[PDB]
Amino acid sequence: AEEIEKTRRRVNALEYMTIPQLEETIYYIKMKLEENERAEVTRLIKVKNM
Amino acid sequence: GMQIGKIIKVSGPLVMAENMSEASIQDMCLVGDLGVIGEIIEMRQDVASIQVYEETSGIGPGEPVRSTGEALSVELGPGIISQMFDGIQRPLDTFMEVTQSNFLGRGVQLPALDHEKQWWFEATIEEGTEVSAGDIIGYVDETKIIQHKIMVPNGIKGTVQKIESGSFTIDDPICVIETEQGLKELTMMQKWPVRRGRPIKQKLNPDVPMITGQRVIDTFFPVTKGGAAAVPGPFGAGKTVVQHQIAKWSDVDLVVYVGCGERGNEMTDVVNEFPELIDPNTGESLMERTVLIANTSNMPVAAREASIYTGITIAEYFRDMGYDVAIMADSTSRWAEALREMSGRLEEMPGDEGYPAYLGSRLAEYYERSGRVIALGSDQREGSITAISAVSPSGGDISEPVTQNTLRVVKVFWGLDSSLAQKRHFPSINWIQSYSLYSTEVGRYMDQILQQDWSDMVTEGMRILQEEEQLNEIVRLVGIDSLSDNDRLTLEVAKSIREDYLQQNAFDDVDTFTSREKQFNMLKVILTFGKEARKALSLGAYFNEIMEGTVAVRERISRSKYIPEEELAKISSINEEIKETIQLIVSE
Amino acid sequence: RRGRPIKQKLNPDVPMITGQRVIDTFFPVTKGGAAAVPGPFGAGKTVVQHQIAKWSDVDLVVYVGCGERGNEMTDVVNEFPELIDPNTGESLMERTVLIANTSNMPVAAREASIYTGITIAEYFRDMGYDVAIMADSTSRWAEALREMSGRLEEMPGDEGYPAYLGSRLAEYYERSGRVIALGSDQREGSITAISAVSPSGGDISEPVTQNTLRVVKVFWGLDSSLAQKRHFPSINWIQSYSLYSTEVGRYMDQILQQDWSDMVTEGMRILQEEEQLNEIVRLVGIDSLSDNDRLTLEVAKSIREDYLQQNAFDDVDTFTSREKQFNMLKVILTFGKEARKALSLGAYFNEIMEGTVAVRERISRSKYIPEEELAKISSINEEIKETIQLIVS
Amino acid sequence: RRGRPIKQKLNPDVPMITGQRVIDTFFPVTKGGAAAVPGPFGAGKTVVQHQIAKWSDVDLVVYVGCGERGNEMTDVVNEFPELIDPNTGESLMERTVLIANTSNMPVAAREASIYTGITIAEYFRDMGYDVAIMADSTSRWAEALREMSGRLEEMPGDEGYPAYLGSRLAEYYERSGRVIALGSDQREGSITAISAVSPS
Amino acid sequence: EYRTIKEVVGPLMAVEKVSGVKYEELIEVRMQNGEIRRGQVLEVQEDKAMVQIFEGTSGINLKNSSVRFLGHPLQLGVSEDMIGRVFDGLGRPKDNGPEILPEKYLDINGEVINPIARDYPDEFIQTGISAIDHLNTLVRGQKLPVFSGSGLPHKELAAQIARQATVLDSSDDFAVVFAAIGITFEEAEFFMEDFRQTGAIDRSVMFMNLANDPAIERIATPRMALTAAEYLAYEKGMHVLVIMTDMTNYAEALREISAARREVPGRRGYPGYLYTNLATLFERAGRIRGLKGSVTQIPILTMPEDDKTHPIPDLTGYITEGQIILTRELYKSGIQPPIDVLPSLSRLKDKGTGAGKTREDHAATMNQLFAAYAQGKQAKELAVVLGESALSDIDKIYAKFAERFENEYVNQGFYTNRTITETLDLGWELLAMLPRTELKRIKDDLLDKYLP
Amino acid sequence: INGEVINPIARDYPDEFIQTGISAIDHLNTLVRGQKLPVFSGSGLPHKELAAQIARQATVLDSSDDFAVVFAAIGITFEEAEFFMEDFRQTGAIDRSVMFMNLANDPAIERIATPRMALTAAEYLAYEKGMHVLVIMTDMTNYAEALREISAARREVPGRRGYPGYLYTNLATLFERAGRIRGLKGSVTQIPILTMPEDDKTHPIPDLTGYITEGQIILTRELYKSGIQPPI
Amino acid sequence: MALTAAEYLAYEKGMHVLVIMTDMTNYAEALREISAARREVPGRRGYPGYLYTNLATLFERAGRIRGLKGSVTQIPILTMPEDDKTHPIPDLTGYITEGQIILTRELYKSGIQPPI
Ligand SMILES: [Cl-]
């Protein structure tokens, strides 16, 4: 019974903490990377016209 | 006939030319003395900014720029079938013949069709007849299969004054029409800009199922005549075989194949294997009713972008005749790569992942040009274009811009799966991930034309497959011997659907095509076994007794796919054997 | 800005003795080689470079303070004259040339300090000397190019750096190397380039580091996480590499008459295995780890703490000879090998660890054993084998 | 755009009584203090700020509808006159000034509404009153600045906002506070700033 | 008429030597081949006007083309004869119907309602959908959107509300304005066939914009629709319900147009003025003091990646007065419509419920049903993670409640219209499952009178 | 040195097995005569040793006539160029080879010219002299960086991730100068070699290359750190 | 201004000077305002390419001089935007200064004083 509960805690740690934190961070970084790429081309277009 | 421009600047792929004030925006041009392919992107006073789609090395100021006086267009007329073009309709076979080389020389301009070949024109309209766009004035027996119908061009309206049968080239005047602007002459060839959709009378709902003969498709994920389907193409999933099956078995009149911008050695395979495809009805090459567009990755970016447009304009042309056309594009991911390249070359504000912000619109423009229509003309004839498009994202992820925008405007998705191919399950169509939004309407059509509860059978068939997924997780965890008799049965019926129905050998003489009538009979017996065995369980019989008692009849079910079309009773009579065999089992 | 002409460029195949264990063993540089040390701020890049400048077996050191802290130049002029080579009697300053253009000195002079330094190094190279040139930091040179590019309103590359950044860096590093100099004598000389790079946020994907890694052959990636737990030198052993490892391995095998190449490969393999194990442990726990995997973690721990970690401020630990390095690594691997056998003989991980406390303490303090007393390290191998066999029975 | 002159600012050290338990107890604002209320949509930001407007022990409320819903401005004009003080028999509307520039009204006027409001607050502060200024929402003010920055073809800073976003915000809040007002009286007054923010 | 086109760069065109040209003025390009394209002045400077052509600049010869400046912005010719008629995105007839004679022409931007003249949304609109009418009530003058996703049945829900929506005790003054934005031919056909089959067309005005129509036409579409709605509401005295889908296609079109002008992109690539732009649409909803009539809006949108923080649903939620959420979990359970009442909200619902509007037991049962369902779902999730033996006897009752609530109450079918009386009565049936002692949100007077 | 574009219907399909002598390739990712099969590597990975090995060991079974190897070095260090040249001489592979060596401190315009010079030599030996030619080119990433330098000098606005919009056309024009041609005895086989910046396969250089070439051989740090040679 | 006063008091008036400057983030923001107004070619986050150099001209104004009794000790204070140490302001400052003392919200919330 104790081994079942120790396994259960490791399952819940992954399911309710570890995995969601990874999913949300991946989504965030992916978004932030795209934003910076657009800001970069925006600057280049400005510098172009200079 | 318009003013020739003079180059004032060469800067990489960008060329500027003055004296261009008589040209137009989006005109195709020949740049420099060599006369390489280019396009007018901008105009400031008389100064045109030109994107050049071939090497500009060796070009400098002072050299001429000649506009073609038109945007990218296609020649449409006798001599177009069985030919292989690139994205801008360069005749690849003719290039070999004329230039006597294995190369597409820079500056070489050759007409898309043969303007010297004699054709027999057969006149079918009488003099004095009032005509307008779409009206058929005659026909040419172009190939061994296809009759090419000569239609009155868009923009022409009036009274036929002179017409007769005879031998002509596509440049000869075959008809005299008395229009408002006076007497005008028609030839067998008309031009059309690839970016503009050929006009119709009315767009209709595509509600008639295509018969592909491929069971997984016709039954569970059907596409209609005028519908559209997306197909991911991972390596080793048997995509090309599925494509070949659809091209030769589907009940369409003509096929337009488009290679968008493919790896050189992969494009060669298509060039090789497609003419080797045999038309089932006539025994002729499939090329007898096929137009093929072949672009390698080093074709001009303009040809790779125009690939699908050049192809659908041609499809629209044969659609206007009253034909059913399949347009098959592979790969639209490579077409979109050309759009991504162009977006960067035009210094635009990029959309998602570097694709232009108008990616979604361009895809919508293409797919909405396919469909079932009433063509122009007094006949009010119907034609259709059914679009089958391969996508091939880098990682095989669907959520990427190209596949995502495609699935917003198409209603069918055939999810080819490489893991199924590794399990020898062919065709490798994932029955869980795939879908058809035509299923409900096709179901109504099928129930009517069969006078059977076909839609009830299909949904029940999918339900068993869906439940199989759930039951397999339990088998993996608990074990097969721990399931109930009802669950063990469901797994067997699902196994029979997968093996005896879904799995289909394209290279087997009989299994390569399954008629609509045969598909019904096959799904009937598979489900009838499930029904009778389940009725046996609730009457006191045991699962193993049913299995051990029905070895002979289940093998008849497994061989049903190989039963000839003339002997469909040998499938239908399995139903009686199932009920009789299981009856004895319930007894004993 | 003109490279001093030579007769012939040669292959740099003689390993530099820096005396720093992680470098000499896992990521070595040869005389005539080029190495970069990219790291975040506060990762100890300065101590690393000073250690190399003071302990390397070259004839001359050209140290270029490029756009950095003024006190670091003051530290060098005060410390160097006090560092006496006992085999010579001469200080390190009597073999050093210093070029200083601090961060608040004129920006354009950062580029000049770089070229001033390399030309002086080439001059002494031409005499037949082995020279090491330290550039700290090349990022400040790149930022001077970027600021001038922006003032000329040029179309920039990534992060505002001019698009010709990679070409400039290439012209510098291609001036380093082992050569035959001009003259009837055909004297051999060399320049070894050691350059600091300072990527923002520690992100090595920035243009300066990326363009540098395309032309240098050794990468000593400094790590913020190692620095925070005071693991020095904070070289990331998973990220770092040396293109000279195979050749240096051959040289060392011949010098030591030992299978040194295998030992280094085995050491790195254990470190790579620890990394893969840690990927699981972090997202699962050490609960289900077998005795073998637990042994792997202990051996890797010993490699990290007893070998890789090295205190530049300890009189003995500040420098480790090749032979002492060999003996230390031998001992560490030997414990792993003997413990491994004991596990297959039915002994438990917990028992093996509890019975070897005293000998593993000797391993942990091997780094402090005097060079004249290397027999106190080599003898550990016999204590390992005797102790572990006693545990088996 | 110019803060009304004072003698000197003082420490805002007297807690406001909003009567809202979570605020007065755990996260209190003082008279002359400033409070930001950033939240996602549909989190009750308008109910919170209305509660503060009607219950806080200030002499006057200046309520600025900056780039938001028209119905919320309609709710204020309907409800405020109906909220009668039992002691004095006066309504909340009889001590309120309302400034409204809704989301679909001219965008530049969002910035105008912010400064119109704080200046009126300073005016009543100078008389020796305690004033609350509610800005809902300051995010829409920043959007206005971003729109104009684009028209002017300025170099964008963080998220397309102009580089002077931070200093504009800092200058606004530094106009709030407890003060000794000008005059031989040396009278004291305060402005307490309550600002909604609407982070995407 | 000017023959002074100076530059064409992409969809953008510069016209020189002009006078009296205004910002946003509509223009007309007569091509060298007689073809006519319309455009809009984006910017006007001295003697130059920067214009964008709706249909693009492909094929245009500069020297032989001419530009006419029309002297007015984009307009809609309005009439009461619009009811029963189908138009495209620019208000052109799409149904082959008779000639339309406009009473007047109206700037499709409309005017801003004076905040002081605006009347708070009030009174009940019966949609016939229980989850809406009872728990998330739609009020006259409210903006109440539907947040959906790809593959979810928002098009069936849109068509159901469109034909079922009505006002009680008020005959022949209700109309629906239906705007389709950037949708495919086949989904347009779905809507057209459904309206005609049910007879909903007879009380509707339809504006149908397709996926392959010009992006500028796609963004003009909702403004054409709202201009028609305001005319019918404020000038004809009608209660008008405006349903628009898909607002996600609208924002994509806006982003496409924004990128064409090379404007600085905001969050996730969408324009920095996305909020403001959406507001100029959604704030046209409401009522006006002293006027008969009202405009009510139901914007329908698909949340990209089912992400509610995405700029499209996010900025919409900052503008609207609540939201109706469709979920895949409920859709996969066969619930029609798959409305999740837990994240759904109507902020103005109080103004459309109670005695004289619906019935006196409206608010109490709503509070109780919502509370019981949330507790029921909570108990269900507890049974999932810890097992059925982790629930108390009461928790089991609430779990069973949440099942019937989803299966019988929320689930009604896409062609079933429930009166508010039927919805309220059905709510009492579900509440009767629970012990009377557990109905703590309802006073004893209501319990004694209604509880079955 | 620009060459001419091969008519897509003039190309013949790759038929003959090429034995590289490397198990992980010959067996699991077979190289066929006329294919373009690139190596995707990274900084500090041993694509140098693999390139030398393949050029050294590559052969077709039977045939008698052997491989002429065109080796192009683009923007590499002298130390690496000397390794290649000395390996070719010490094994006699130089007698089969034509080498075009471009260094990191050579002009950007020379780096751009190098692949075109090498491929022009290959097509001449193959399509005019009837030889079977194996073309090995490293490092293609150095080629791409040279393009950015010229592009910036013309003040061109970059496309995705800082590279020219026409990068695809550019790479495609180089990599498609390969394969068998109908009616011709000789052929060109290509093995482009590139380092993936930050080991990122979504980077424009390896991403676009994979769209053009018929597969890729991938080297990894995990295998190399474990002492696997070659770390495929 | 402050550093000129400091170096004066230290090196011309023989004092030991402690310099405290807050908030350095507000200094960098002002630099960016001017850089943006001049339409200069932006670096990271819109900050000018010369941010490191500019900050160095301030922080390097500290230390001691041989033969002089005085000294300048600097304690600059900056708030890290979004608590992000990799932001240009704390990142570049860290490459210049002789260490840094970092306060965290985690330690602060746990009642640690100072939350270093
Ligand atoms: Cl809100």
mmCIF file of all heavy atoms in Angstrom, chain B residues 119-125 127 137-140 162-168 173-175 188, unseen atoms left out:
data_model
loop_
_atom_site.group_PDB
_atom_site.id
_atom_site.type_symbol
_atom_site.label_atom_id
_atom_site.label_comp_id
_atom_site.label_asym_id
_atom_site.label_seq_id
_atom_site.Cartn_x
_atom_site.Cartn_y
_atom_site.Cartn_z
ATOM 1 N N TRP B 119 -5.000 18.976 -86.829
ATOM 2 C CA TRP B 119 -6.044 18.262 -86.109
ATOM 3 C C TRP B 119 -7.278 18.217 -86.986
ATOM 4 O O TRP B 119 -7.520 19.138 -87.762
ATOM 5 C CB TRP B 119 -6.401 18.990 -84.810
ATOM 6 C CG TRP B 119 -5.295 19.055 -83.808
ATOM 7 C CD1 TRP B 119 -4.428 20.088 -83.610
ATOM 8 C CD2 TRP B 119 -4.940 18.044 -82.857
ATOM 9 N NE1 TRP B 119 -3.551 19.781 -82.598
ATOM 10 C CE2 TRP B 119 -3.845 18.531 -82.119
ATOM 11 C CE3 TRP B 119 -5.441 16.772 -82.561
ATOM 12 C CZ2 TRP B 119 -3.243 17.793 -81.100
ATOM 13 C CZ3 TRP B 119 -4.841 16.039 -81.553
ATOM 14 C CH2 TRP B 119 -3.753 16.553 -80.834
ATOM 15 N N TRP B 120 -8.068 17.157 -86.870
ATOM 16 C CA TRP B 120 -9.354 17.146 -87.545
ATOM 17 C C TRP B 120 -10.407 17.809 -86.670
ATOM 18 O O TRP B 120 -10.759 17.295 -85.608
ATOM 19 C CB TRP B 120 -9.801 15.733 -87.910
ATOM 20 C CG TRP B 120 -11.145 15.736 -88.572
ATOM 21 C CD1 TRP B 120 -12.351 15.496 -87.982
ATOM 22 C CD2 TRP B 120 -11.423 16.026 -89.947
ATOM 23 N NE1 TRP B 120 -13.361 15.604 -88.906
ATOM 24 C CE2 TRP B 120 -12.816 15.929 -90.121
ATOM 25 C CE3 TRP B 120 -10.627 16.349 -91.049
ATOM 26 C CZ2 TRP B 120 -13.431 16.145 -91.350
ATOM 27 C CZ3 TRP B 120 -11.238 16.559 -92.270
ATOM 28 C CH2 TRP B 120 -12.626 16.458 -92.411
ATOM 29 N N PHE B 121 -10.898 18.959 -87.117
ATOM 30 C CA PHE B 121 -11.979 19.639 -86.424
ATOM 31 C C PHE B 121 -13.305 19.142 -86.971
ATOM 32 O O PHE B 121 -13.522 19.142 -88.182
ATOM 33 C CB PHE B 121 -11.864 21.154 -86.600
ATOM 34 C CG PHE B 121 -13.054 21.916 -86.085
ATOM 35 C CD1 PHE B 121 -13.307 21.999 -84.725
ATOM 36 C CD2 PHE B 121 -13.918 22.556 -86.961
ATOM 37 C CE1 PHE B 121 -14.400 22.697 -84.248
ATOM 38 C CE2 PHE B 121 -15.014 23.256 -86.491
ATOM 39 C CZ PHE B 121 -15.254 23.328 -85.131
ATOM 40 N N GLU B 122 -14.185 18.699 -86.081
ATOM 41 C CA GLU B 122 -15.515 18.270 -86.487
ATOM 42 C C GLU B 122 -16.544 19.289 -86.015
ATOM 43 O O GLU B 122 -16.732 19.478 -84.816
ATOM 44 C CB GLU B 122 -15.831 16.884 -85.921
ATOM 45 C CG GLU B 122 -17.170 16.313 -86.373
ATOM 46 C CD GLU B 122 -17.193 15.949 -87.850
ATOM 47 O OE1 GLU B 122 -16.116 15.660 -88.415
ATOM 48 O OE2 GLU B 122 -18.292 15.952 -88.447
ATOM 49 N N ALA B 123 -17.197 19.952 -86.963
ATOM 50 C CA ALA B 123 -18.196 20.967 -86.643
ATOM 51 C C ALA B 123 -19.519 20.329 -86.237
ATOM 52 O O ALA B 123 -20.003 19.407 -86.894
ATOM 53 C CB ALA B 123 -18.396 21.904 -87.822
ATOM 54 N N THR B 124 -20.103 20.823 -85.150
ATOM 55 C CA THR B 124 -21.343 20.259 -84.631
ATOM 56 C C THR B 124 -22.446 21.302 -84.490
ATOM 57 O O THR B 124 -23.567 20.982 -84.099
ATOM 58 C CB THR B 124 -21.124 19.580 -83.270
ATOM 59 O OG1 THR B 124 -20.537 20.516 -82.357
ATOM 60 C CG2 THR B 124 -20.206 18.375 -83.421
ATOM 61 N N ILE B 125 -22.127 22.550 -84.808
ATOM 62 C CA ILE B 125 -23.112 23.621 -84.732
ATOM 63 C C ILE B 125 -23.423 24.163 -86.127
ATOM 64 O O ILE B 125 -22.544 24.236 -86.986
ATOM 65 C CB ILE B 125 -22.644 24.748 -83.777
ATOM 66 C CG1 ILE B 125 -23.815 25.639 -83.370
ATOM 67 C CG2 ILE B 125 -21.515 25.568 -84.392
ATOM 68 C CD1 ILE B 125 -23.472 26.585 -82.250
ATOM 69 N N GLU B 127 -24.746 27.010 -88.984
ATOM 70 C CA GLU B 127 -24.576 28.438 -89.223
ATOM 71 C C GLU B 127 -25.864 29.194 -88.909
ATOM 72 O O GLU B 127 -26.961 28.709 -89.183
ATOM 73 C CB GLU B 127 -24.148 28.685 -90.672
ATOM 74 C CG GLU B 127 -22.869 27.958 -91.057
ATOM 75 C CD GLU B 127 -22.483 28.160 -92.509
ATOM 76 O OE1 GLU B 127 -23.279 28.762 -93.263
ATOM 77 O OE2 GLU B 127 -21.381 27.714 -92.897
ATOM 78 N N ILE B 137 -18.882 24.534 -80.303
ATOM 79 C CA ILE B 137 -19.063 24.685 -81.740
ATOM 80 C C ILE B 137 -18.576 23.445 -82.486
ATOM 81 O O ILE B 137 -18.848 23.274 -83.674
ATOM 82 C CB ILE B 137 -18.339 25.937 -82.266
ATOM 83 C CG1 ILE B 137 -16.830 25.817 -82.043
ATOM 84 C CG2 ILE B 137 -18.875 27.182 -81.578
ATOM 85 C CD1 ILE B 137 -16.033 26.976 -82.613
ATOM 86 N N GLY B 138 -17.862 22.581 -81.774
ATOM 87 C CA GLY B 138 -17.338 21.361 -82.357
ATOM 88 C C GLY B 138 -16.387 20.655 -81.414
ATOM 89 O O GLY B 138 -16.244 21.044 -80.258
ATOM 90 N N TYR B 139 -15.731 19.611 -81.909
ATOM 91 C CA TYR B 139 -14.822 18.836 -81.075
ATOM 92 C C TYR B 139 -13.646 18.278 -81.866
ATOM 93 O O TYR B 139 -13.696 18.169 -83.090
ATOM 94 C CB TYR B 139 -15.568 17.692 -80.374
ATOM 95 C CG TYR B 139 -16.125 16.641 -81.315
ATOM 96 C CD1 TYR B 139 -15.345 15.567 -81.732
ATOM 97 C CD2 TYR B 139 -17.432 16.719 -81.781
ATOM 98 C CE1 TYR B 139 -15.846 14.608 -82.592
ATOM 99 C CE2 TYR B 139 -17.943 15.761 -82.640
ATOM 100 C CZ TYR B 139 -17.145 14.708 -83.042
ATOM 101 O OH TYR B 139 -17.644 13.751 -83.897
ATOM 102 N N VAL B 140 -12.587 17.926 -81.147
ATOM 103 C CA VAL B 140 -11.450 17.238 -81.734
ATOM 104 C C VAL B 140 -11.170 15.983 -80.920
ATOM 105 O O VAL B 140 -11.051 16.045 -79.699
ATOM 106 C CB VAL B 140 -10.187 18.125 -81.732
ATOM 107 C CG1 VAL B 140 -9.007 17.366 -82.313
ATOM 108 C CG2 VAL B 140 -10.432 19.406 -82.509
ATOM 109 N N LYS B 162 -19.942 31.334 -90.394
ATOM 110 C CA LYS B 162 -19.257 30.334 -91.210
ATOM 111 C C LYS B 162 -18.521 29.304 -90.358
ATOM 112 O O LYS B 162 -17.748 29.657 -89.467
ATOM 113 C CB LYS B 162 -18.282 31.006 -92.182
ATOM 114 N N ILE B 163 -18.768 28.029 -90.641
ATOM 115 C CA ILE B 163 -18.113 26.940 -89.926
ATOM 116 C C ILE B 163 -18.242 25.624 -90.695
ATOM 117 O O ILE B 163 -19.301 25.312 -91.239
ATOM 118 C CB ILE B 163 -18.667 26.784 -88.484
ATOM 119 C CG1 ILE B 163 -17.889 25.716 -87.713
ATOM 120 C CG2 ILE B 163 -20.162 26.479 -88.503
ATOM 121 C CD1 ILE B 163 -18.313 25.574 -86.269
ATOM 122 N N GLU B 164 -17.151 24.868 -90.762
ATOM 123 C CA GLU B 164 -17.181 23.544 -91.372
ATOM 124 C C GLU B 164 -16.069 22.654 -90.833
ATOM 125 O O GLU B 164 -15.070 23.141 -90.306
ATOM 126 C CB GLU B 164 -17.102 23.635 -92.900
ATOM 127 C CG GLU B 164 -15.867 24.341 -93.435
ATOM 128 C CD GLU B 164 -15.809 24.335 -94.955
ATOM 129 O OE1 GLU B 164 -16.588 23.583 -95.578
ATOM 130 O OE2 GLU B 164 -14.989 25.085 -95.525
ATOM 131 N N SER B 165 -16.256 21.345 -90.961
ATOM 132 C CA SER B 165 -15.257 20.381 -90.527
ATOM 133 C C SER B 165 -14.049 20.436 -91.450
ATOM 134 O O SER B 165 -14.149 20.899 -92.587
ATOM 135 C CB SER B 165 -15.845 18.969 -90.526
ATOM 136 O OG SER B 165 -17.076 18.930 -89.824
ATOM 137 N N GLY B 166 -12.906 19.963 -90.963
ATOM 138 C CA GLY B 166 -11.697 19.964 -91.764
ATOM 139 C C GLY B 166 -10.435 19.873 -90.933
ATOM 140 O O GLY B 166 -10.489 19.858 -89.705
ATOM 141 N N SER B 167 -9.295 19.809 -91.611
ATOM 142 C CA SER B 167 -8.003 19.743 -90.941
ATOM 143 C C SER B 167 -7.434 21.142 -90.715
ATOM 144 O O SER B 167 -7.341 21.941 -91.647
ATOM 145 C CB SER B 167 -7.026 18.902 -91.761
ATOM 146 O OG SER B 167 -5.758 18.842 -91.133
ATOM 147 N N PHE B 168 -7.057 21.433 -89.473
ATOM 148 C CA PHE B 168 -6.536 22.747 -89.106
ATOM 149 C C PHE B 168 -5.475 22.631 -88.021
ATOM 150 O O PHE B 168 -5.421 21.635 -87.298
ATOM 151 C CB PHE B 168 -7.657 23.643 -88.569
ATOM 152 C CG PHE B 168 -8.819 23.808 -89.507
ATOM 153 C CD1 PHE B 168 -9.932 22.991 -89.401
ATOM 154 C CD2 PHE B 168 -8.809 24.794 -90.477
ATOM 155 C CE1 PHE B 168 -11.007 23.143 -90.256
ATOM 156 C CE2 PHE B 168 -9.881 24.952 -91.336
ATOM 157 C CZ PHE B 168 -10.982 24.126 -91.224
ATOM 158 N N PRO B 173 -8.237 29.853 -88.424
ATOM 159 C CA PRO B 173 -9.616 30.270 -88.150
ATOM 160 C C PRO B 173 -10.605 29.171 -88.528
ATOM 161 O O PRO B 173 -10.754 28.855 -89.707
ATOM 162 C CB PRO B 173 -9.800 31.486 -89.061
ATOM 163 C CG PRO B 173 -8.828 31.275 -90.173
ATOM 164 C CD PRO B 173 -7.644 30.593 -89.552
ATOM 165 N N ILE B 174 -11.267 28.595 -87.530
ATOM 166 C CA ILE B 174 -12.210 27.504 -87.761
ATOM 167 C C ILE B 174 -13.653 27.993 -87.753
ATOM 168 O O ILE B 174 -14.571 27.245 -88.090
ATOM 169 C CB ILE B 174 -12.072 26.399 -86.691
ATOM 170 C CG1 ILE B 174 -12.213 27.004 -85.290
ATOM 171 C CG2 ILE B 174 -10.742 25.667 -86.839
ATOM 172 C CD1 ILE B 174 -12.555 26.004 -84.211
ATOM 173 N N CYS B 175 -13.854 29.250 -87.369
ATOM 174 C CA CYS B 175 -15.202 29.774 -87.188
ATOM 175 C C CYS B 175 -15.260 31.288 -87.381
ATOM 176 O O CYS B 175 -14.323 32.003 -87.030
ATOM 177 C CB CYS B 175 -15.720 29.398 -85.795
ATOM 178 S SG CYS B 175 -17.492 29.641 -85.547
ATOM 179 N N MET B 188 -8.913 27.225 -82.393
ATOM 180 C CA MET B 188 -9.130 26.155 -81.423
ATOM 181 C C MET B 188 -8.377 26.377 -80.116
ATOM 182 O O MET B 188 -8.436 25.544 -79.212
ATOM 183 C CB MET B 188 -8.738 24.804 -82.022
ATOM 184 C CG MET B 188 -9.630 24.366 -83.167
ATOM 185 S SD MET B 188 -9.209 22.586 -83.824
ATOM 186 C CE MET B 188 -7.470 22.936 -84.633
#
